[PDB]
Copies of this chain bind each other. A is one copy, B any other.
Amino acid sequence: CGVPAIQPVLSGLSRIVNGEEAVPGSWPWQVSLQDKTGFHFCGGSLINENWVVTAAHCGVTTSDVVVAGEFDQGSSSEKIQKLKIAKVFKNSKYNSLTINNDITLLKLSTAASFSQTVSAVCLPSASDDFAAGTTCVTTGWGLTRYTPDRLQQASLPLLSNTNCKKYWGTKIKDAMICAGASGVSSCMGDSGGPLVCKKNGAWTLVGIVSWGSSTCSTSTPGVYARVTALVNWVQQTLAAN
């Protein structure tokens, strides 16, 4: 896990304004979530061939589909896997008013076929420490909400929650983590999309997109679900189903 067969290329432009285009297939856990009608509404991350992790505030149901292997949402030409959802597991601690504990698991009906362009992100241990100032990467088609239809990426640093409160105040809870405000926007991440950091040669899922600056400010950090705080619940859910 965490080692793409097609390696990401990250340039200085990933650090400013709205990031830059990714190399196709270089973020192989990134999936798109489409509703009954084919409309892309959220992101998510494969954690193995049968399970996708996304945000609870996406409100995914079993009439939505998981789309793997995608790069260009405007191309009907690329090999993709449209996978049906058999069951949705929303974290019971999710507070839909503060958006705290913002995580949901999706169990697929049939397994994805892992390949060079479809494979799993690594999950952290609950005890892992990702320090403030660490450069991490967020990816998604979140800029289409306002414009390129190809997968974008940005490099942005983690913040301590204390420093994140200077921007967002009391909305920041312990199961949250912030990144950005470094002169680059966080809006390329879809709701539910990944924030990953490279630990010992492998990319690890550190955050899930919860919300960001209402104006895509380059000086306002994104707020993510903190995966260390929720990974025990993830592993308990996989073991019981």
A→B interface (CB under 8 Å)? 41-42, 57-59, 95-97, 191, 214
Contact = CB atoms under 8 A, between A and B. Distances in A.
Give the oligomeric copy count.
Answer: 2
A97 B214 contact: no
Nearest to A213: B214
User: Which of A58, A95, A97, A191 has the most chain B CB within a 10 Å cutoff?
Assistant: A97
A135 B60 CA distance: 38
A35 to B, nearest CB: 10
Contact of A41 (B41, B58, B97, B214): B97
B96 A42 contact: no
Contacts of A57: 96-97
A207 to B, nearest CB: 18
A186 to B, nearest CB: 16
Which 4 A-B pairs rank lowest in CB-CB distance, beginning with the nearest?
A: A59-B96, A57-B96, A58-B97, A59-B97
A42 B41 CA distance: 28
A178 to B, nearest CB: 16
Nearest to A192: B97
B214 A95 contact: no
A97 B211 CA distance: 11
A232 B37 CA distance: 26
A97 B57 CA distance: 6
Contacts of A214: 214
A214 B42 CA distance: 23
A165 to B, nearest CB: 14
Tell me which of A59, A96, A214 has the highest count of chain B C-beta atoms within 10 A of its own C-beta. A96
